[PDB]
């Protein structure tokens, strides 16, 4: 059972600035045969179900703005949102779908800084 | 934490036939304020990240075929696939995104009968 750990649990960022979200997997999710990281990032906006943002660690789901970028490999991953916009307020989750049972991180609540 | 009990583990189907997958949550995932079930169904074809099919128990994701339908409210949910197609041969998981940690059911592997 792979455990996903995100940090920070809460993040306050100003409009137009950069937001950084971390996720660590207890075991590597990099598969040797195809060199792919079975790591994905989800965005759950208020009143909506979680939506897929990035998979394979850095591939953006069609429709997702380029300001959302994923990086990392093995056990250390990062989600970066450049130029934060008001609509980006939500809870972000990382997911490992390398081996069942698939598991999410505990989430990072992103809010606009007071 | 909420536990998702999915069944059956494996399902051998014939093209054009109707497939039924069941999933029960250890606690109700029905939120009072919006009267919505924080329950989703995902499809995972080979070599692809999990793909969202249905959320709010019965709301289909855009682009998802009408032959996929979700039913149930509270704790007992059902995913039905009518007029089964070769493309539908995959593994299916129910997901509860009511409260962290989010959790998937064990999963149901769909295959064509010999």
Give the overall shape of chain A, derived from the CA principal axes: globular
Largest interface: A-B, 20 and 19 residues
Number of domains of chain A: 1
What is the fold-level CATH name, i.e. the topology of chain A? Immunoglobulin-like
**Strand segment tally of chain A:** 13
Order of helical and strand elements of chain A: EEEEEEEEEEEEE
Oligomer designation: homodimer
* CATH class designation of chain A: Mainly Beta
Q: Summarize the biggest pleated sheet of chain A.
A: 7 strands, mixed
- The total count of helices of chain A amounts to 0
Q: In percent, how helical is the residue content of chain A?
A: under 10%
Structural class of chain A: mainly beta
Distance between the termini of chain A: 39 Å
Please tell me the CATH architecture of chain A by its name.
Answer: Sandwich
Q: What is the gyration radius of chain A calculated from CA atoms? A: 13 Å
The CATH fourth-level homologous superfamily of chain A: Immunoglobulins
Tell me the fraction of residues in β-strands of chain A, as a range: over 45%
PDB class: immune system
Keywords: beta barrel immunoglobulin VL domain dimer, flipped domain dimer, immune system
Assembly: dimeric
Entry title: change in dimerization mode by removal of a single unsatisfied polar residue
